[PDB]
Amino acid sequence: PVIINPVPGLPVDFIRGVDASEAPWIIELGGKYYDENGVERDLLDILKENGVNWIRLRVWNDPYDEQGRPYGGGNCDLPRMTDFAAKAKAKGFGVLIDFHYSDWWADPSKQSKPKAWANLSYPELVEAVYNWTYNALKYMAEHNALPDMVQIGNEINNGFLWPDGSAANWTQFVGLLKAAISAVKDVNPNIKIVIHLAGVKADFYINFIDRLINSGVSFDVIAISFYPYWHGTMDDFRNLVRTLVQRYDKKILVAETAYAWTLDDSDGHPNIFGSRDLEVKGGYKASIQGQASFIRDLIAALYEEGKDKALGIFYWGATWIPYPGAGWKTGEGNPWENQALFDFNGRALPSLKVFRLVYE
Ligand SMILES: [Ca+2]
Ligand SMILES: [Cl-]
């Protein structure tokens, strides 16, 4: 029962993607996904028929401890992530791989160097990011899972691989950033490079990207993490986009975004989207309709301003349904299930058709 306006002039090759990084782990535990009718189907088939054409997957180097026990949060190591990307690309999907260059979660508040990279000197570290990235993408290419797009680090606002690439050390930061890129192009120079940033502070994007472009860092896409309840209003997003299309001749992408289809909880583990508090920040209400309205408007806002540089969006945590063992951390539960595009029973929400109903 979801009402939605079409987006006039929206290209058929527009990136209407989702981040399904947690899905592979969920399926291994016995988690099941159901289509609009509520019958059990292949997840990728459910996404495709709903209009999703791209898949985004994060990759951690070694999300396990010295005892072999997994960290959690999907346990997104290269072998498990590559197997899903292979099946997705086999089903026609486009693939964006997000190398966090960390053993676990990375964002502008934490950018841990992997356990084996921790005490490598800077020169040895440059040799590490290159050789790992090269072999990483060489691994995916052979399982027929070469990603169309690569994302050098996740939300690298304050840099990555701290402290050696802590943005403060801009010179070293650029060396490591370039080193990874050199690796990607050596595997295939038609793979597109994605620089991912969080927030919609336009004046920061200017300062950061200008210094990046001037440093010789070659990339194709400027990716954005936009969570309205954190980063600002729809208008704040509009101002960022138009500022990027005028100042830069590069593509504009939303690497991460999400909203709440409900406020309830399923597994007893409190969610990030918890109270009506975040609901007044987002400007949209926490219903299945409110979720869909936000997504359609984000696609519209991006294209109406992005013009021919508008690339598309990825809905983050789309497949993160509540399931025992598939929490955000080993031993803990799910804080995101009320922001997925599936309900607690694993059934596709009627707002999943937003990636298809934006057309006409
Ligand atoms: Ca929960
Ligand atoms: Cl430096």
Numbering used by the authors: 37 to 396
Task: Copy the relevant paper text.
Endo-β-1,4-galactanases, in particular hydrolyse galactan and arabinogalactan in pectin, a major component of the primary plant cell wall, with important functions in plant defence and application in the food and other industries. This catalytic domain, obtained from the C-terminal truncation of the full-length gene also encoding an Ig-like and a putative binding domain exhibits a temperature activity optimum of 95 °C making it an asset for future industrial biomass degradation.
As other enzymes in the GH53 family and clan GH-A, the overall structure of IaGal is a (β/α)8 barrel (also known as TIM barrel) which consists of 8 parallel β-sheets (here referred as β1 to β8) and 8 α-helices (here referred as α1 to α8) that alternate along the peptide chain. Loops connecting βn and αn will be referred to the nth β/α-loop. All galactanases structurally characterized to date contain a stabilizing interaction between the 7th and 8th β/α-loop in the (β/α)8 barrel except for BtGal, which has a significantly shorter 7th β/α-loop. The stabilizing interaction has been shown to be a disulphide bridge in all fungal galactanases, and a calcium binding site in BlGal (purple) and now archaeal (green) enzymes. This results in a coordination number for the calcium ion of 7 in IaGal compared to 6 in BlGal. The IaGal contains − 1, − 2 and − 3 binding subsites in addition to the + subsites, while the fungal galactanases are devoid of the − 3 subsite and BlGal contains the additional − 4 subsite. Differential scanning calorimetry (DSC) indicated a thermal denaturation midpoint (Tm) of 105 °C for IaGal making it to our knowledge the most thermostable galactanase ever reported.
